[PDB]
Design a protein around this ligand. Structure first.
Ligand SMILES: *[C@H](CS(=O)(=O)NOCc1ccccc1)[C@H](CCc1ccccc1)NC(=O)[C@H](Cc1ccccc1)NC(=O)N1CCN(C)CC1
Length: 215
């Protein structure tokens, strides 16, 4: 695999968002992955709707959590693979209360056919990302509240409780790392991103990696 990859540099990643006081991280992880996969399939980079998942994804728990894999499946099996645009279905759960699910007056921004779950191995996840793009991953973000910058070489890895987006890595660095897009605004970390050591399963990053499949 290539020594270093950064999908942000190739214009495949949308701007860092804000989930607010809602535990909708799972939706941001899933949608963020779909936005990248849709762009890479030959369509212009479009901001898609997390709110669609938070409000309509009944297999998940809105502001109380969910799984990216459940979100991928709900989109395909319950929503005919349709993912609405953000402009047509704006995020409105920033206070902690999700509004009811509305199925009309929205615009379909992307369509997925399914999803693939990657092996629990960092080198294989890196290989897949290098060829296919950003990957949605679950991590333990307990120690992330105090992150200000730099490569996190020591991360509390006890329980999966947060969803993020892997956008790259650098194997040639003194301490190889992963580049991760978070959803706690650009004021957190390095303009919304966090770099964690690669190769030691920091924050349980290899445990639940997956990606939507467009075409
Ligand atoms: C996103 C969480 S976050 O609020 O952005 N960060 O939390 C970091 C943190 C800090 C201290 C302790 C623990 C975690 C969401 C929050 C969900 C939430 C739960 C309860 C109360 C408020 C908010 N995290 C999730 O959605 C995770 C993501 C995940 C994906 C894949 C695999 C594991 C985890 N999932 C869940 O919380 N659940 C809820 C219960 N159901 C059964 C499964 C998904």
């Amino acid at each position: 695999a290539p020594a270093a990859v950064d999908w942000r540099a190739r214009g495949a990643v949308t701007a860092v968002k804000d989930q607010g006081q809602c535990g909708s991280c799972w939706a941001f992880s899933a949608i963020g992955n779909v936005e990248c996969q849709w762009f890479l399939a030959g369509h212009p980079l479009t901001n898609l709707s997390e709110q669609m998942l938070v409000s309509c994804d009944k297999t998940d728990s809105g502001c109380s959590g969910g799984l990216m894999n459940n979100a991928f499946e709900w989109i395909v099996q319950e929503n005919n693979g349709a993912v609405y645009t953000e402009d047509s279905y704006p995020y409105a759960s920033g206070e902690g209360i999700s509004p009811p699910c509305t199925t009309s007056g929205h615009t379909v921004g992307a369509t997925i056919t399914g999803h693939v779950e990657l092996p629990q191995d960092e080198a294989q996840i890196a290989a897949w990302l290098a060829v296919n793009g950003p990957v949605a991953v679950a991590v333990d973000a307990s120690s992330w509240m105090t992150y200000t910058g730099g490569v996190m070489t020591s991360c509390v890895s006890e329980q999966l409780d947060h969803g993020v987006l892997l956008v790259g890595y650098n194997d040639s660095a003194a301490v190889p790392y992963w580049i991760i897009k978070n959803s706690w605004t650009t004021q957190w970390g390095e303009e919304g991103y966090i770099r964690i050591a690669k190769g030691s399963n920091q924050c349980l990053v290899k445990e639940e990696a997956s990606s939507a499949v467009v075409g």
